[PDB]
Design a protein around this ligand. Structure first.
Ligand SMILES: CCCCCCCCCCCCCCCCCC(=O)OC[C@H](COP(=O)([O-])OCC(O)COP(=O)([O-])OC[C@@H](COC(=O)CCCCCCCCCCCCCCCCC)OC(=O)CCCCCCCCCCCCCCCCC)OC(=O)CCCCCCCCCCCCCCCCC
Ligand SMILES: CCCCCCCCCCCCCCCCCC(=O)OC[C@H](COP(=O)([O-])OCC(O)COP(=O)([O-])OC[C@@H](COC(=O)CCCCCCCCCCCCCCCCC)OC(=O)CCCCCCCCCCCCCCCCC)OC(=O)CCCCCCCCCCCCCCCCC
Ligand SMILES: CCCCCCCCCCCCCCCCCC(=O)OC[C@H](COP(=O)([O-])OCC(O)COP(=O)([O-])OC[C@@H](COC(=O)CCCCCCCCCCCCCCCCC)OC(=O)CCCCCCCCCCCCCCCCC)OC(=O)CCCCCCCCCCCCCCCCC
Ligand SMILES: CCCCCCCCCCCCCCCC(=O)OC[C@H](COP(=O)(O)O)OC(=O)CCCCCCCCCCCCCCC
Ligand SMILES: CCCCCCCCCCCCO[C@@H]1O[C@H](CO)[C@@H](O[C@H]2O[C@H](CO)[C@@H](O)[C@H](O)[C@H]2O)[C@H](O)[C@H]1O
Ligand SMILES: COCCOCCOCCOc1ccc(C(C)(C)CC(C)(C)C)cc1
Ligand SMILES: COCCOCCOCCOc1ccc(C(C)(C)CC(C)(C)C)cc1
Ligand SMILES: COCCOCCOCCOc1ccc(C(C)(C)CC(C)(C)C)cc1
Lengths: 69, 103, 81, 114, 97, 63, 103, 96, 81, 81, 52
């Protein structure tokens, strides 16, 4: 088994742990971790890569024109 | 696939059930808040709640998102490996060639 | 600084031997499959029919990588100058 | 979810190898030959060859063919044609000037491209 | 009183010749002439020897001069070219690239 | 043995090209002897659509 | 008794997705050729790549003969036929002086 | 040494110089046909190749429009991205 | 930059040793099939006739990879200058 | 570009060791065939006569690949200059 | 690969009734094992047809 985006539930309505249990930490810590998390992982990585290449973009085509003189 | 799938499933279940726990804790009264009254007038919320509707509205929402924003996303992905590359100056058109008297 | 481009034509035919050394390393694994089928049928002849698919299945896959190892050395010579 | 299907005998494998051995036995049955006119050159040890005693079967099937036994041999003279032309070519005298100007499939010929 | 267009016995006798063929009856009977006079044995040898022959001719003598010569000397030069190609003195006597 | 000995002696004294290689001096001399055109470089790498799938093309440069 | 087997190929095709499969196959193959192989191989601007020994080995049964150039002379004959059918002036192209996109 | 970088001349100047080179290569064929004493039909069969090459260079030059200047193109220059300032939808404008 | 082409004639042979070195690795897989047939008949003599075809089949396949590796070594020398 | 042809005479002798390294690998298969036949005979003495033919077969024929692994190294020196 | 499949064979001959339960592992052992062979093969073919 071990399907993607899948989770089982017990009689108490709680998710059963497949590999790791993370329900010992308090609700405040869980809300702190998850207030900024989303259901998206790879898009943030691609966005950070794009921001790095934007910080390191080329401006030679502007240097030839004289925008830095 | 990777063996981290159950780890990601645990983390997804964590965030989902914690958001539900938050909604249970705050309880009723969300419709009186300002957030709800703005989401009622917010087009993002209209689109997002129309996506899950039946009658082909998932296909409609996905294709609309594509036609509107996904083209710019494709261009952005193509331009990620273009931002770092040396490019020449733009040969701006002199806007002189093309004029011709009518006869 | 100075820049000397060099085109080493000997590497056309060196890498052929370097890949050729690896073409036989799958064979010892290839024979493992048929040895296993033999001894498994020696333990249970009646099962020899149900395992024979897994025997043929075990050969062509194990043999394939050897072929892929053989591809590069033949891709190395008859196209590159 | 829990269908409880009985075993189907048609999905088993207990006839393929018997059938193949039946076909092979039908093949080898046509290799039966009489004692008269029998001769087979054995190895130098005196032990039999491999391909030797399995020529009678093939030619007994050629006997039963109808068209291949009268057509498939017409490509065999071409082998002797090659045997003769190769020996002619191993020592053919040629012009040195023409060999130096137009070598066949030689490398680094700019007229070819490389 | 059959109401359909009854087909004669001889017509059925002839159609049976066409529909009573087996797979081997097609495969071997048509493959033997094909394999013998095909791209493998005869036609292939001919048509692929011609390429090398006329390559050698156009390299050594020229196609125009070759056309101007007689059919006998043409065939002689073609045979010499065929021998040069079959020999393949430059490939180490091997018909490989 | 006769053929290969003769061919080897001619390859040694440079009257015949080596095995598998087109030699320039011998080819030019044979062309001058037979009165034929000299072996040029008729290829055109800069022709339209010859090195389009080539990631490492060849650059035009007037020498 | 009526059957689409013997009375309607259209309704037979419609009632069997396994008859749609070859048609979709054909359409996809032709679309693939149109998108990729058309302009890169078959166009006159891209036809000399068949003379390459790496990307088109022995397309003419031999290495390509550049001294002869059959492609060049065939296409030159065809362009000459086009020019004769159109009655176009050869030397009119040489009287042109294109400007430059100054500034 | 060598470097992977931007094209030296603009597209318009590149096509202009290509058209001039094909004009030269066609003029040479024409001058050679005139020196050989060929007629119109023979000159056609001679230099149809260079004529077509010149016509293709002319087609490329006519096909390439240099870009127009506007705020979107200038912002794209500042962002250093390949951008079409004539599309409200991007890649989907091809199908819409 | 400057451009020096080099044609190393010595490289006609350096690969041949490597191609020759890889011919012996399949020999273990070769003998692994006869060893398997031996132990199989040693556990069930009656089945010796039905496993002999598998034995001959495996010897050829293991031997072929060694034989395939050999083609590079022999092709590397007698044609290339 | 310039073209420097070089003839590395040392490569006449380098490759000799490179091929020589592969001469001992088949030994493990060769001894394996006997290590099988011994245990098989210890499992069934009476069947020793029927396995001996298939005990010398793989014996000499794994050594045959060793022979061609060795024949190159001996063909590498006393004929090449 | 043949190590995995030989293990499956000897496990099936030891216990025919377990032939189906270990078939998923028979496929899982091959998929992400042949993949490592492909990553190596992917480099060797990526090493030539893209680098100038
Ligand atoms: C800031 C974050 C701060 C918080 C960080 C701490 C994390 C705490 C947990 C919070 C909850 C959470 O993270 O949920 C996951 C949450 C969402 O993750 P997810 O549920 O797996 O995403 C859903 C899909 O799996 C992926 O979603 P998707 O939409 O991105 O999928 C699209 C993707 C498809 O993705 C795939 O399916 C894989 C396909 C292969 C693609 C591989 C190449 C992709 C790269 C090119 C693009 O598409 C592609 O890959 C394009 C490829 C096309 C190729 C064309 C040929 O994570 C985030 O909030 C994102 C930011 C943080 C990520 C890092 C998380 C830290 C992990 C460390 C864990 C160690 C334990 C820590 C606990 C112990 C502490 C004491
Ligand atoms: C929302 C928009 C989603 C549409 C997506 C799309 O791709 O549409 C364009 C797409 C083709 O547009 P395009 O190729 O970019 O523009 C050039 C024209 O096709 C130029 O062709 P045309 O305008 O002269 O022909 C018009 C008309 C004339 O039709 C007829 O003459 C009937 C006969 O219909 C067609 O010919 C169908 C379109 C062209 C052929 C199929 C698409 C070509 C794709 C690339 C080549 C694939 C080769 C396919 C080979 C098929 C086997 C031979 O059209 C279609 O394939 C289906 C159109 C269905 C229209 C239904 C409208 C009813 C609404 C109620
Ligand atoms: C949709 C809203 C309805 C349209 C209103 C009715 C109308 O007549 O349309 C007027 C306006 C001009 O259209 P047009 O007169 O038909 O076309 C002539 C040229 O395209 C005219 O080109 P342009 O340089 O004048 O572009 C003007 C651009 C405004 O351009 C900027 O403000 C860029 C500087 C940003 C400052 C930070 O658009 C606007 O003026 C207002 C919308 C923003 O429509 C648009 O420009 C469509 C805008 C829709 C969003 C597309 C992206 C806008 C910003 C792109 C910046 C450069 C791309 C950077 C990559 C990021 C892309 C997301
Ligand atoms: C910026 C770094 C980019 C260079 C390498 C990219 C590695 C991404 C690191 C981000 C870790 C976040 C989790 C993740 O990406 O995902 C970690 C992935 C697993 O992701 P999947 O389960 O979706 O396949 O781990 C890997 O196997 C690849 C990373 C190797 C290091
Ligand atoms: C925890 C504290 C850590 C201390 C260390 C912090 C180090 C942070 C990294 C600084 C590195 C900056 O890295 C440098 O960025 C500049 C732009 O900013 C890049 O430069 C880029 O932008 C310039 C500016 O227009 C362009 O003209 C240029 O063509 C392009 O290369 C350099 O190529 C890169 O070398
Ligand atoms: C080692 O090989 C094992 C592979 O097993 C193949 C199993 O399939 C065997 C099929 O062989 C045949 C061929 C023909 C036939 C008959 C005799 C039924 C043909 C017929 C219809 C002409 C009488 C039966 C079995
Ligand atoms: C379609 O598949 C069927 C093909 O089967 C072909 C099998 O080929 C092997 C047949 O060749 C032989 C081998 C041995 C023998 C005879 C020599 C068995 C030994 C004998 C006659 C001395 C007892 C006869 C024919
Ligand atoms: C090891 O086997 C090698 C022989 O393979 C020969 C390949 O022959 C091609 C197909 O040959 C036939 C022809 C007819 C048939 C039959 C007679 C069974 C056809 C059928 C089923 C229509 C009666 C089977 C095979």
């Amino acid at each position: 088994g071990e399907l993607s985006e899948y989770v089982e539930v017990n009689e108490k309505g709680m998710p059963k742990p497949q590999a790791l249990s993370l329900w010992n930490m308090p609700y405040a810590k869980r809300r702190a971790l998850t207030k900024f998390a989303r259901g998206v992982r790879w898009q943030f990585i691609v966005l950070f890569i794009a921001l790095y290449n934007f910080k390191n973009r080329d401006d030679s085509h502007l240097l030839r024109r004289g925008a830095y003189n | 696939s990777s063996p981290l799938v159950p780890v990601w499933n645990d983390l997804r279940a964590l965030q989902v059930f914690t958001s539900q726990e938050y909604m249970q804790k705050r309880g009723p009264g969300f419709t009186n808040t300002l957030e709800y009254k703005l989401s009622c007038l917010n087009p993002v919320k209209w689109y997002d709640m129309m996506k899950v509707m039946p009658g082909g509205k998932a296909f409609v929402g996905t294709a609309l998102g594509l036609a509107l924003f996904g083209g710019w996303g494709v261009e952005f992905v193509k331009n990620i490996s273009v931002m770092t590359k040396e490019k020449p100056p733009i040969d701006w058109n002199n806007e002189k060639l093309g004029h011709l008297t009518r006869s | 600084a100075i820049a000397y481009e060099v085109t080493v034509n000997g590497a056309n035919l060196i890498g052929a031997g370097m890949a050729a050394s690896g073409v036989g390393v799958p064979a010892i694994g290839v024979a493992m499959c048929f040895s296993s089928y033999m001894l498994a049928a020696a333990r249970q002849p009646n099962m020899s029919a149900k395992l024979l698919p897994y025997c043929i299945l075990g050969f062509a896959l194990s043999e394939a990588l050897a072929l892929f190892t053989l591809l590069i050395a033949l891709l190395e010579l008859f196209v590159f100058s | 979810a829990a269908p409880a299907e009985k075993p189907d005998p048609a999905l088993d494998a207990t006839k393929a190898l018997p059938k193949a051995l039946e076909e092979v036995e039908f093949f080898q049955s046509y290799a039966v030959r009489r004692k008269t006119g029998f001769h087979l050159f054995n190895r130098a040890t005196g032990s039999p060859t491999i391909v030797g005693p399995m020529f009678y079967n093939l030619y007994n099937f050629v006997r039963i063919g109808r068209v291949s036994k009268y057509v498939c041999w017409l490509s065999l003279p071409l082998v002797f044609q090659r045997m003769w032309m190769k020996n002619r070519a191993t020592g053919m005298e040629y012009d040195i000037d023409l060999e130096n100007y137009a070598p066949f499939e030689a490398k680094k010929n700019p007229m070819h491209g490389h | 009183a059959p109401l359909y267009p009854v087909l004669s016995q001889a017509s059925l006798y002839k159609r049976h010749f066409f529909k009573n063929i087996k797979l081997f009856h097609v495969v071997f009977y048509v493959g033997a002439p094909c394999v013998t006079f095909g791209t493998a044995a005869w036609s292939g040898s001919n048509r692929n020897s011609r390429e090398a022959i006329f390559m050698v001719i156009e390299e050594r003598h020229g196609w125009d001069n070759f056309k101007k010569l007689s059919s006998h000397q043409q065939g002689v030069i073609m045979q010499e070219a065929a021998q040069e190609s079959l020999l393949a003195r430059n490939k180490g006597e091997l018909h490989l690239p | 043995n006769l053929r290969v000995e003769w061919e080897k002696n001619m390859e040694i004294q440079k009257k015949l090209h080596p095995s598998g290689l087109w030699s320039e001096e011998q080819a030019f001399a044979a062309a001058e002897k037979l009165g034929r055109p000299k072996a040029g470089h008729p290829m055109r790498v800069f022709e339209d659509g010859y090195q389009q799938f080539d990631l490492k093309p060849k650059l035009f440069d007037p020498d | 008794v009526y059957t689409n087997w013997q009375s309607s190929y259209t309704r037979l095709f419609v009632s069997k997705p396994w008859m749609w499969h070859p048609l979709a196959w054909m359409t996809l193959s032709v679309g693939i050729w149109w998108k990729f192989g058309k302009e890169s191989l078959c166009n006159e601007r891209s036809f000399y790549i068949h003379t390459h020994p790496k990307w088109a080995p022995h397309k003419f049964h031999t290495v390509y003969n550049w001294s002869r150039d059959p492609i060049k002379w065939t296409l030159a004959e065809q362009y000459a036929s086009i020019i004769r059918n159109t009655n176009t002036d050869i030397e009119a192209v040489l009287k042109i002086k294109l400007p430059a996109n100054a500034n | 040494s060598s470097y992977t970088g931007a094209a030296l001349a603009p597209k318009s100047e590149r096509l202009r110089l290509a058209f001039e080179e094909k004009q030269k290569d066609h003029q040479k064929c024409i001058e050679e046909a005139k020196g050989k004493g060929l007629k119109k039909d023979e000159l056609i069969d001679a230099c149809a190749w260079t004529h077509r090459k010149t016509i293709l260079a002319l087609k490329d030059w006519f096909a390439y429009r240099p870009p127009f200047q506007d705020r979107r193109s200038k912002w794209a220059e500042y962002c250093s991205i390949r951008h079409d300032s004539g599309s409200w939808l991007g890649w989907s404008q091809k199908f819409f």
